[PDB]
PDB file of all heavy atoms in Angstrom:
ATOM      1  N   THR A   1     -12.883 -10.566 -10.799  1.00 12.63           N
ATOM      2  CA  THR A   1     -13.212 -11.783 -10.096  1.00 12.63           C
ATOM      3  C   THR A   1     -13.774 -12.852 -10.981  1.00 12.63           C
ATOM      4  O   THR A   1     -13.624 -14.036 -10.588  1.00 12.63           O
ATOM      5  CB  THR A   1     -14.213 -11.418  -9.012  1.00 12.63           C
ATOM      6  OG1 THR A   1     -15.492 -11.079  -9.579  1.00 12.63           O
ATOM      7  CG2 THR A   1     -13.743 -10.291  -8.137  1.00 12.63           C
ATOM      8  N   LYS A   2     -14.351 -12.544 -12.135  1.00 11.80           N
ATOM      9  CA  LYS A   2     -15.035 -13.559 -12.936  1.00 11.80           C
ATOM     10  C   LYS A   2     -14.529 -13.481 -14.403  1.00 11.80           C
ATOM     11  O   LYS A   2     -14.123 -12.463 -14.845  1.00 11.80           O
ATOM     12  CB  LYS A   2     -16.571 -13.396 -12.873  1.00 11.80           C
ATOM     13  CG  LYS A   2     -17.145 -13.426 -11.483  1.00 11.80           C
ATOM     14  CD  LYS A   2     -18.671 -13.461 -11.548  1.00 11.80           C
ATOM     15  CE  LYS A   2     -19.220 -12.229 -12.255  1.00 11.80           C
ATOM     16  NZ  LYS A   2     -20.625 -12.417 -12.707  1.00 11.80           N
ATOM     17  N   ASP A   3     -14.646 -14.618 -15.107  1.00 11.72           N
ATOM     18  CA  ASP A   3     -14.280 -14.673 -16.518  1.00 11.72           C
ATOM     19  C   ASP A   3     -15.438 -14.084 -17.350  1.00 11.72           C
ATOM     20  O   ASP A   3     -16.494 -13.677 -16.838  1.00 11.72           O
ATOM     21  CB  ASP A   3     -13.969 -16.131 -16.893  1.00 11.72           C
ATOM     22  CG  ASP A   3     -13.215 -16.204 -18.185  1.00 11.72           C
ATOM     23  OD1 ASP A   3     -12.781 -15.130 -18.715  1.00 11.72           O
ATOM     24  OD2 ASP A   3     -13.008 -17.323 -18.682  1.00 11.72           O
ATOM     25  N   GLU A   4     -15.203 -14.071 -18.649  1.00 10.49           N
ATOM     26  CA  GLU A   4     -16.249 -13.631 -19.542  1.00 10.49           C
ATOM     27  C   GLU A   4     -17.506 -14.460 -19.533  1.00 10.49           C
ATOM     28  O   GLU A   4     -18.604 -13.937 -19.610  1.00 10.49           O
ATOM     29  CB  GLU A   4     -15.716 -13.483 -21.009  1.00 10.49           C
ATOM     30  CG  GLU A   4     -14.521 -12.554 -21.132  1.00 10.49           C
ATOM     31  CD  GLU A   4     -13.893 -12.612 -22.493  1.00 10.49           C
ATOM     32  OE1 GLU A   4     -14.041 -13.674 -23.234  1.00 10.49           O
ATOM     33  OE2 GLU A   4     -13.207 -11.650 -22.926  1.00 10.49           O
ATOM     34  N   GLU A   5     -17.283 -15.773 -19.411  1.00 11.72           N
ATOM     35  CA  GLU A   5     -18.365 -16.722 -19.271  1.00 11.72           C
ATOM     36  C   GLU A   5     -18.709 -17.042 -17.779  1.00 11.72           C
ATOM     37  O   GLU A   5     -19.227 -18.188 -17.505  1.00 11.72           O
ATOM     38  CB  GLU A   5     -18.090 -18.043 -19.989  1.00 11.72           C
ATOM     39  CG  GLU A   5     -17.753 -17.820 -21.492  1.00 11.72           C
ATOM     40  CD  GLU A   5     -17.918 -19.153 -22.298  1.00 11.72           C
ATOM     41  OE1 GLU A   5     -19.018 -19.787 -22.176  1.00 11.72           O
ATOM     42  OE2 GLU A   5     -16.975 -19.459 -23.030  1.00 11.72           O
ATOM     43  N   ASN A   6     -18.444 -16.042 -16.937  1.00 10.92           N
ATOM     44  CA  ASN A   6     -18.781 -16.136 -15.459  1.00 10.92           C
ATOM     45  C   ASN A   6     -18.013 -17.278 -14.794  1.00 10.92           C
ATOM     46  O   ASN A   6     -18.355 -17.684 -13.692  1.00 10.92           O
ATOM     47  CB  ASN A   6     -20.315 -16.303 -15.228  1.00 10.92           C
ATOM     48  CG  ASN A   6     -20.985 -15.072 -15.590  1.00 10.92           C
ATOM     49  OD1 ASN A   6     -20.991 -14.028 -14.948  1.00 10.92           O
ATOM     50  ND2 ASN A   6     -21.766 -15.127 -16.674  1.00 10.92           N
ATOM     51  N   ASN A   7     -16.960 -17.747 -15.362  1.00 12.31           N
ATOM     52  CA  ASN A   7     -16.116 -18.803 -14.692  1.00 12.31           C
ATOM     53  C   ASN A   7     -15.301 -18.144 -13.560  1.00 12.31           C
ATOM     54  O   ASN A   7     -14.822 -17.036 -13.693  1.00 12.31           O
ATOM     55  CB  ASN A   7     -15.186 -19.449 -15.697  1.00 12.31           C
ATOM     56  CG  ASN A   7     -15.935 -20.025 -16.943  1.00 12.31           C
ATOM     57  OD1 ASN A   7     -16.851 -20.864 -16.749  1.00 12.31           O
ATOM     58  ND2 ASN A   7     -15.524 -19.572 -18.079  1.00 12.31           N
ATOM     59  N   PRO A   8     -15.184 -18.834 -12.439  1.00 13.58           N
ATOM     60  CA  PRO A   8     -14.464 -18.243 -11.354  1.00 13.58           C
ATOM     61  C   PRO A   8     -12.940 -18.050 -11.668  1.00 13.58           C
ATOM     62  O   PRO A   8     -12.413 -18.849 -12.410  1.00 13.58           O
ATOM     63  CB  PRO A   8     -14.632 -19.222 -10.186  1.00 13.58           C
ATOM     64  CG  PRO A   8     -15.732 -20.134 -10.588  1.00 13.58           C
ATOM     65  CD  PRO A   8     -15.762 -20.149 -12.096  1.00 13.58           C
ATOM     66  N   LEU A   9     -12.397 -17.061 -11.068  1.00 11.76           N
ATOM     67  CA  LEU A   9     -10.955 -16.754 -11.320  1.00 11.76           C
ATOM     68  C   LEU A   9     -10.171 -16.940  -9.992  1.00 11.76           C
ATOM     69  O   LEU A   9     -10.665 -16.589  -8.927  1.00 11.76           O
ATOM     70  CB  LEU A   9     -10.794 -15.337 -11.791  1.00 11.76           C
ATOM     71  CG  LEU A   9     -11.411 -14.935 -13.139  1.00 11.76           C
ATOM     72  CD1 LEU A   9     -11.062 -13.558 -13.572  1.00 11.76           C
ATOM     73  CD2 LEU A   9     -11.035 -15.976 -14.230  1.00 11.76           C
ATOM     74  N   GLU A  10      -8.999 -17.537 -10.071  1.00 10.47           N
ATOM     75  CA  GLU A  10      -8.121 -17.754  -8.946  1.00 10.47           C
ATOM     76  C   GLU A  10      -6.912 -16.868  -8.955  1.00 10.47           C
ATOM     77  O   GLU A  10      -6.243 -16.818 -10.030  1.00 10.47           O
ATOM     78  CB  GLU A  10      -7.715 -19.259  -8.831  1.00 10.47           C
ATOM     79  CG  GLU A  10      -8.888 -20.207  -8.954  1.00 10.47           C
ATOM     80  CD  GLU A  10      -8.535 -21.620  -8.516  1.00 10.47           C
ATOM     81  OE1 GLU A  10      -7.389 -21.881  -8.269  1.00 10.47           O
ATOM     82  OE2 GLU A  10      -9.419 -22.441  -8.411  1.00 10.47           O
ATOM     83  N   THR A  11      -6.567 -16.182  -7.927  1.00 14.10           N
ATOM     84  CA  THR A  11      -5.509 -15.212  -7.882  1.00 14.10           C
ATOM     85  C   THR A  11      -4.181 -15.925  -7.615  1.00 14.10           C
ATOM     86  O   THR A  11      -4.082 -16.793  -6.787  1.00 14.10           O
ATOM     87  CB  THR A  11      -5.757 -14.178  -6.842  1.00 14.10           C
ATOM     88  OG1 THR A  11      -7.040 -13.616  -6.957  1.00 14.10           O
ATOM     89  CG2 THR A  11      -4.722 -13.012  -6.968  1.00 14.10           C
ATOM     90  N   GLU A  12      -3.116 -15.516  -8.319  1.00 10.40           N
ATOM     91  CA  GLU A  12      -1.779 -15.942  -8.162  1.00 10.40           C
ATOM     92  C   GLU A  12      -0.948 -14.893  -7.406  1.00 10.40           C
ATOM     93  O   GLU A  12      -0.508 -13.941  -7.987  1.00 10.40           O
ATOM     94  CB  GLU A  12      -1.128 -16.295  -9.460  1.00 10.40           C
ATOM     95  CG  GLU A  12      -1.401 -17.713  -9.994  1.00 10.40           C
ATOM     96  CD  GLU A  12      -2.876 -17.904 -10.261  1.00 10.40           C
ATOM     97  OE1 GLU A  12      -3.467 -16.958 -10.921  1.00 10.40           O
ATOM     98  OE2 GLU A  12      -3.441 -18.937  -9.897  1.00 10.40           O
ATOM     99  N   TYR A  13      -0.867 -14.995  -6.063  1.00  6.29           N
ATOM    100  CA  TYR A  13      -0.201 -13.996  -5.270  1.00  6.29           C
ATOM    101  C   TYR A  13       1.285 -13.997  -5.628  1.00  6.29           C
ATOM    102  O   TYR A  13       1.880 -12.870  -5.593  1.00  6.29           O
ATOM    103  CB  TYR A  13      -0.408 -14.338  -3.781  1.00  6.29           C
ATOM    104  CG  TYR A  13      -1.848 -14.203  -3.356  1.00  6.29           C
ATOM    105  CD1 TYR A  13      -2.639 -15.350  -3.150  1.00  6.29           C
ATOM    106  CD2 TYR A  13      -2.414 -12.975  -3.037  1.00  6.29           C
ATOM    107  CE1 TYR A  13      -3.986 -15.222  -2.739  1.00  6.29           C
ATOM    108  CE2 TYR A  13      -3.709 -12.810  -2.665  1.00  6.29           C
ATOM    109  CZ  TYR A  13      -4.487 -13.945  -2.499  1.00  6.29           C
ATOM    110  OH  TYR A  13      -5.789 -13.832  -2.076  1.00  6.29           O
ATOM    111  N   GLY A  14       1.909 -15.122  -5.858  1.00  7.41           N
ATOM    112  CA  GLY A  14       3.328 -15.167  -6.161  1.00  7.41           C
ATOM    113  C   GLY A  14       3.722 -14.384  -7.409  1.00  7.41           C
ATOM    114  O   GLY A  14       4.769 -13.749  -7.495  1.00  7.41           O
ATOM    115  N   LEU A  15       2.863 -14.469  -8.425  1.00  7.89           N
ATOM    116  CA  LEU A  15       3.121 -13.869  -9.714  1.00  7.89           C
ATOM    117  C   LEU A  15       2.952 -12.365  -9.666  1.00  7.89           C
ATOM    118  O   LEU A  15       3.346 -11.634 -10.588  1.00  7.89           O
ATOM    119  CB  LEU A  15       2.339 -14.520 -10.829  1.00  7.89           C
ATOM    120  CG  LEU A  15       2.435 -15.959 -10.970  1.00  7.89           C
ATOM    121  CD1 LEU A  15       1.620 -16.478 -12.197  1.00  7.89           C
ATOM    122  CD2 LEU A  15       3.863 -16.430 -11.129  1.00  7.89           C
ATOM    123  N   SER A  16       2.214 -11.865  -8.670  1.00  8.29           N
ATOM    124  CA  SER A  16       1.954 -10.421  -8.574  1.00  8.29           C
ATOM    125  C   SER A  16       3.149  -9.676  -8.106  1.00  8.29           C
ATOM    126  O   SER A  16       4.165 -10.216  -7.700  1.00  8.29           O
ATOM    127  CB  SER A  16       0.768 -10.186  -7.677  1.00  8.29           C
ATOM    128  OG  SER A  16      -0.407 -10.803  -8.091  1.00  8.29           O
ATOM    129  N   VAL A  17       3.071  -8.313  -8.202  1.00  7.54           N
ATOM    130  CA  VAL A  17       4.164  -7.447  -7.806  1.00  7.54           C
ATOM    131  C   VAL A  17       3.655  -6.480  -6.746  1.00  7.54           C
ATOM    132  O   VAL A  17       2.564  -5.876  -6.902  1.00  7.54           O
ATOM    133  CB  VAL A  17       4.669  -6.613  -9.049  1.00  7.54           C
ATOM    134  CG1 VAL A  17       5.828  -5.663  -8.604  1.00  7.54           C
ATOM    135  CG2 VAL A  17       5.173  -7.577 -10.141  1.00  7.54           C
ATOM    136  N   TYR A  18       4.456  -6.372  -5.614  1.00  9.72           N
ATOM    137  CA  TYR A  18       4.072  -5.510  -4.571  1.00  9.72           C
ATOM    138  C   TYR A  18       5.306  -4.611  -4.212  1.00  9.72           C
ATOM    139  O   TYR A  18       6.405  -4.985  -4.419  1.00  9.72           O
ATOM    140  CB  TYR A  18       3.631  -6.296  -3.314  1.00  9.72           C
ATOM    141  CG  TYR A  18       2.472  -7.195  -3.555  1.00  9.72           C
ATOM    142  CD1 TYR A  18       2.661  -8.412  -4.096  1.00  9.72           C
ATOM    143  CD2 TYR A  18       1.216  -6.754  -3.227  1.00  9.72           C
ATOM    144  CE1 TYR A  18       1.514  -9.296  -4.325  1.00  9.72           C
ATOM    145  CE2 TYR A  18       0.114  -7.558  -3.437  1.00  9.72           C
ATOM    146  CZ  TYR A  18       0.286  -8.834  -3.939  1.00  9.72           C
ATOM    147  OH  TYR A  18      -0.825  -9.618  -4.176  1.00  9.72           O
ATOM    148  N   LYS A  19       5.006  -3.423  -3.674  1.00  5.78           N
ATOM    149  CA  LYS A  19       6.068  -2.490  -3.254  1.00  5.78           C
ATOM    150  C   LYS A  19       5.786  -1.984  -1.857  1.00  5.78           C
ATOM    151  O   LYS A  19       4.562  -1.843  -1.480  1.00  5.78           O
ATOM    152  CB  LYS A  19       6.170  -1.293  -4.193  1.00  5.78           C
ATOM    153  CG  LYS A  19       5.038  -0.353  -4.269  1.00  5.78           C
ATOM    154  CD  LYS A  19       5.163   0.718  -5.290  1.00  5.78           C
ATOM    155  CE  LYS A  19       6.300   1.701  -4.823  1.00  5.78           C
ATOM    156  NZ  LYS A  19       6.672   2.578  -5.910  1.00  5.78           N
ATOM    157  N   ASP A  20       6.797  -1.682  -1.086  1.00  7.71           N
ATOM    158  CA  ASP A  20       6.631  -1.287   0.326  1.00  7.71           C
ATOM    159  C   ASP A  20       6.072   0.147   0.389  1.00  7.71           C
ATOM    160  O   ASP A  20       6.304   1.009  -0.514  1.00  7.71           O
ATOM    161  CB  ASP A  20       7.914  -1.407   1.115  1.00  7.71           C
ATOM    162  CG  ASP A  20       8.550  -2.732   0.922  1.00  7.71           C
ATOM    163  OD1 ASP A  20       8.220  -3.704   1.735  1.00  7.71           O
ATOM    164  OD2 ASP A  20       9.426  -2.915   0.001  1.00  7.71           O
ATOM    165  N   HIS A  21       5.394   0.470   1.472  1.00  8.89           N
ATOM    166  CA  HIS A  21       4.857   1.815   1.670  1.00  8.89           C
ATOM    167  C   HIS A  21       4.711   2.093   3.223  1.00  8.89           C
ATOM    168  O   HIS A  21       4.365   1.167   3.971  1.00  8.89           O
ATOM    169  CB  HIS A  21       3.471   1.911   1.005  1.00  8.89           C
ATOM    170  CG  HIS A  21       2.703   3.166   1.458  1.00  8.89           C
ATOM    171  ND1 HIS A  21       2.978   4.383   0.926  1.00  8.89           N
ATOM    172  CD2 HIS A  21       1.752   3.348   2.310  1.00  8.89           C
ATOM    173  CE1 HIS A  21       2.143   5.293   1.423  1.00  8.89           C
ATOM    174  NE2 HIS A  21       1.347   4.655   2.324  1.00  8.89           N
ATOM    175  N   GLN A  22       5.009   3.309   3.591  1.00  6.37           N
ATOM    176  CA  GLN A  22       4.912   3.690   4.997  1.00  6.37           C
ATOM    177  C   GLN A  22       4.636   5.216   5.039  1.00  6.37           C
ATOM    178  O   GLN A  22       4.970   5.930   4.124  1.00  6.37           O
ATOM    179  CB  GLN A  22       6.216   3.339   5.723  1.00  6.37           C
ATOM    180  CG  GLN A  22       6.142   3.529   7.266  1.00  6.37           C
ATOM    181  CD  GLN A  22       7.386   3.148   7.915  1.00  6.37           C
ATOM    182  OE1 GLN A  22       8.359   4.008   8.011  1.00  6.37           O
ATOM    183  NE2 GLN A  22       7.598   1.954   8.432  1.00  6.37           N
ATOM    184  N   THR A  23       4.114   5.627   6.148  1.00  6.55           N
ATOM    185  CA  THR A  23       3.816   7.047   6.389  1.00  6.55           C
ATOM    186  C   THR A  23       4.402   7.440   7.747  1.00  6.55           C
ATOM    187  O   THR A  23       4.248   6.771   8.731  1.00  6.55           O
ATOM    188  CB  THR A  23       2.321   7.366   6.385  1.00  6.55           C
ATOM    189  OG1 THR A  23       1.737   6.797   5.207  1.00  6.55           O
ATOM    190  CG2 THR A  23       2.082   8.814   6.401  1.00  6.55           C
ATOM    191  N   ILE A  24       5.067   8.636   7.739  1.00  6.84           N
ATOM    192  CA  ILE A  24       5.703   9.117   8.971  1.00  6.84           C
ATOM    193  C   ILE A  24       5.303  10.593   9.203  1.00  6.84           C
ATOM    194  O   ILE A  24       4.818  11.296   8.280  1.00  6.84           O
ATOM    195  CB  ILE A  24       7.223   8.989   8.986  1.00  6.84           C
ATOM    196  CG1 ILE A  24       7.868   9.908   7.886  1.00  6.84           C
ATOM    197  CG2 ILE A  24       7.634   7.568   8.686  1.00  6.84           C
ATOM    198  CD1 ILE A  24       9.360  10.130   8.004  1.00  6.84           C
ATOM    199  N   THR A  25       5.528  11.077  10.397  1.00  9.37           N
ATOM    200  CA  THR A  25       5.220  12.405  10.795  1.00  9.37           C
ATOM    201  C   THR A  25       6.469  13.125  11.292  1.00  9.37           C
ATOM    202  O   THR A  25       7.220  12.569  12.047  1.00  9.37           O
ATOM    203  CB  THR A  25       4.092  12.518  11.816  1.00  9.37           C
ATOM    204  OG1 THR A  25       2.965  11.826  11.376  1.00  9.37           O
ATOM    205  CG2 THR A  25       3.749  13.955  12.111  1.00  9.37           C
ATOM    206  N   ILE A  26       6.685  14.353  10.857  1.00  8.09           N
ATOM    207  CA  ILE A  26       7.869  15.177  11.237  1.00  8.09           C
ATOM    208  C   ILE A  26       7.409  16.394  11.964  1.00  8.09           C
ATOM    209  O   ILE A  26       6.506  17.140  11.450  1.00  8.09           O
ATOM    210  CB  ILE A  26       8.727  15.565  10.001  1.00  8.09           C
ATOM    211  CG1 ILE A  26       9.526  14.323   9.532  1.00  8.09           C
ATOM    212  CG2 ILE A  26       9.675  16.689  10.324  1.00  8.09           C
ATOM    213  CD1 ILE A  26      10.268  14.552   8.317  1.00  8.09           C
ATOM    214  N   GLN A  27       7.952  16.663  13.193  1.00 11.19           N
ATOM    215  CA  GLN A  27       7.593  17.812  14.000  1.00 11.19           C
ATOM    216  C   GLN A  27       8.800  18.722  14.112  1.00 11.19           C
ATOM    217  O   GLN A  27       9.940  18.254  14.169  1.00 11.19           O
ATOM    218  CB  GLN A  27       7.108  17.340  15.391  1.00 11.19           C
ATOM    219  CG  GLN A  27       6.570  18.474  16.248  1.00 11.19           C
ATOM    220  CD  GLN A  27       6.476  18.124  17.697  1.00 11.19           C
ATOM    221  OE1 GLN A  27       5.607  17.319  18.106  1.00 11.19           O
ATOM    222  NE2 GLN A  27       7.359  18.673  18.507  1.00 11.19           N
ATOM    223  N   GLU A  28       8.483  19.998  14.241  1.00 11.47           N
ATOM    224  CA  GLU A  28       9.553  20.985  14.365  1.00 11.47           C
ATOM    225  C   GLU A  28      10.288  20.785  15.701  1.00 11.47           C
ATOM    226  O   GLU A  28       9.706  20.426  16.696  1.00 11.47           O
ATOM    227  CB  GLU A  28       8.984  22.401  14.373  1.00 11.47           C
ATOM    228  CG  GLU A  28       9.993  23.527  14.487  1.00 11.47           C
ATOM    229  CD  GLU A  28       9.345  24.882  14.380  1.00 11.47           C
ATOM    230  OE1 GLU A  28       8.225  25.045  14.859  1.00 11.47           O
ATOM    231  OE2 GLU A  28      10.024  25.838  13.869  1.00 11.47           O
ATOM    232  N   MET A  29      11.591  20.919  15.646  1.00  8.59           N
ATOM    233  CA  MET A  29      12.478  20.700  16.807  1.00  8.59           C
ATOM    234  C   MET A  29      12.123  21.694  17.866  1.00  8.59           C
ATOM    235  O   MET A  29      12.042  22.904  17.627  1.00  8.59           O
ATOM    236  CB  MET A  29      13.944  20.735  16.412  1.00  8.59           C
ATOM    237  CG  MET A  29      14.473  19.568  15.689  1.00  8.59           C
ATOM    238  SD  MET A  29      15.887  19.932  14.701  1.00  8.59           S
ATOM    239  CE  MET A  29      17.053  20.368  15.998  1.00  8.59           C
ATOM    240  N   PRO A  30      11.872  21.225  19.131  1.00  8.88           N
ATOM    241  CA  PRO A  30      11.613  22.239  20.228  1.00  8.88           C
ATOM    242  C   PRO A  30      12.715  23.202  20.471  1.00  8.88           C
ATOM    243  O   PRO A  30      12.453  24.293  21.054  1.00  8.88           O
ATOM    244  CB  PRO A  30      11.326  21.297  21.410  1.00  8.88           C
ATOM    245  CG  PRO A  30      10.945  19.990  20.815  1.00  8.88           C
ATOM    246  CD  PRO A  30      11.797  19.856  19.597  1.00  8.88           C
ATOM    247  N   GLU A  31      13.953  22.868  20.133  1.00 10.45           N
ATOM    248  CA  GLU A  31      15.116  23.737  20.454  1.00 10.45           C
ATOM    249  C   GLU A  31      15.005  25.031  19.592  1.00 10.45           C
ATOM    250  O   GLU A  31      15.607  26.028  19.936  1.00 10.45           O
ATOM    251  CB  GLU A  31      16.432  22.997  20.176  1.00 10.45           C
ATOM    252  CG  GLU A  31      16.610  21.822  21.102  1.00 10.45           C
ATOM    253  CD  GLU A  31      17.458  20.730  20.391  1.00 10.45           C
ATOM    254  OE1 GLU A  31      18.262  21.068  19.589  1.00 10.45           O
ATOM    255  OE2 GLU A  31      17.185  19.555  20.719  1.00 10.45           O
ATOM    256  N   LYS A  32      14.265  24.971  18.446  1.00 12.20           N
ATOM    257  CA  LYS A  32      14.182  26.100  17.514  1.00 12.20           C
ATOM    258  C   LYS A  32      12.821  26.771  17.529  1.00 12.20           C
ATOM    259  O   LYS A  32      12.682  27.918  17.093  1.00 12.20           O
ATOM    260  CB  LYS A  32      14.515  25.694  16.099  1.00 12.20           C
ATOM    261  CG  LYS A  32      15.813  24.850  16.001  1.00 12.20           C
ATOM    262  CD  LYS A  32      17.000  25.660  16.411  1.00 12.20           C
ATOM    263  CE  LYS A  32      18.292  24.876  16.318  1.00 12.20           C
ATOM    264  NZ  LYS A  32      19.544  25.731  16.396  1.00 12.20           N
ATOM    265  N   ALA A  33      11.829  26.027  17.991  1.00 10.17           N
ATOM    266  CA  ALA A  33      10.407  26.598  17.952  1.00 10.17           C
ATOM    267  C   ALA A  33      10.327  27.716  18.964  1.00 10.17           C
ATOM    268  O   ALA A  33      10.987  27.719  20.069  1.00 10.17           O
ATOM    269  CB  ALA A  33       9.418  25.523  18.281  1.00 10.17           C
ATOM    270  N   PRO A  34       9.519  28.707  18.713  1.00  8.20           N
ATOM    271  CA  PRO A  34       9.352  29.838  19.676  1.00  8.20           C
ATOM    272  C   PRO A  34       8.706  29.391  20.995  1.00  8.20           C
ATOM    273  O   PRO A  34       7.893  28.404  20.958  1.00  8.20           O
ATOM    274  CB  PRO A  34       8.365  30.824  18.969  1.00  8.20           C
ATOM    275  CG  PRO A  34       8.596  30.527  17.495  1.00  8.20           C
ATOM    276  CD  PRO A  34       8.843  29.028  17.439  1.00  8.20           C
ATOM    277  N   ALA A  35       9.147  29.930  22.060  1.00 10.76           N
ATOM    278  CA  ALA A  35       8.659  29.533  23.372  1.00 10.76           C
ATOM    279  C   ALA A  35       7.206  29.877  23.552  1.00 10.76           C
ATOM    280  O   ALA A  35       6.730  30.959  23.166  1.00 10.76           O
ATOM    281  CB  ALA A  35       9.496  30.112  24.469  1.00 10.76           C
ATOM    282  N   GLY A  36       6.436  28.967  24.163  1.00 13.35           N
ATOM    283  CA  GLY A  36       5.060  29.218  24.483  1.00 13.35           C
ATOM    284  C   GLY A  36       4.064  29.015  23.284  1.00 13.35           C
ATOM    285  O   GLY A  36       2.898  29.411  23.382  1.00 13.35           O
TER     286      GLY A  36
END
């Protein structure tokens, strides 16, 4: 956030690099799971 001489720093969002991320859940198929 700060320079060596405590000078404020401004972020360049466009020059940064981002990657997508997601989380999902997988459940066993009821057609194969034991009954009950």
Side-chain angles (χ1 to χ4, degrees):
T1 69
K2 303 188 300 159
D3 199 6
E4 300 172 338
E5 303 200 51
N6 292 289
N7 305 303
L9 300 184
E10 309 194 354
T11 310
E12 275 64 45
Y13 295 101
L15 305 183
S16 298
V17 179
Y18 302 84
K19 67 182 291 168
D20 309 273
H21 168 80
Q22 189 181 84
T23 310
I24 68 166
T25 305
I26 285 177
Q27 187 197 287
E28 182 178 33
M29 284 156 64
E31 298 149 32
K32 313 296 181 165

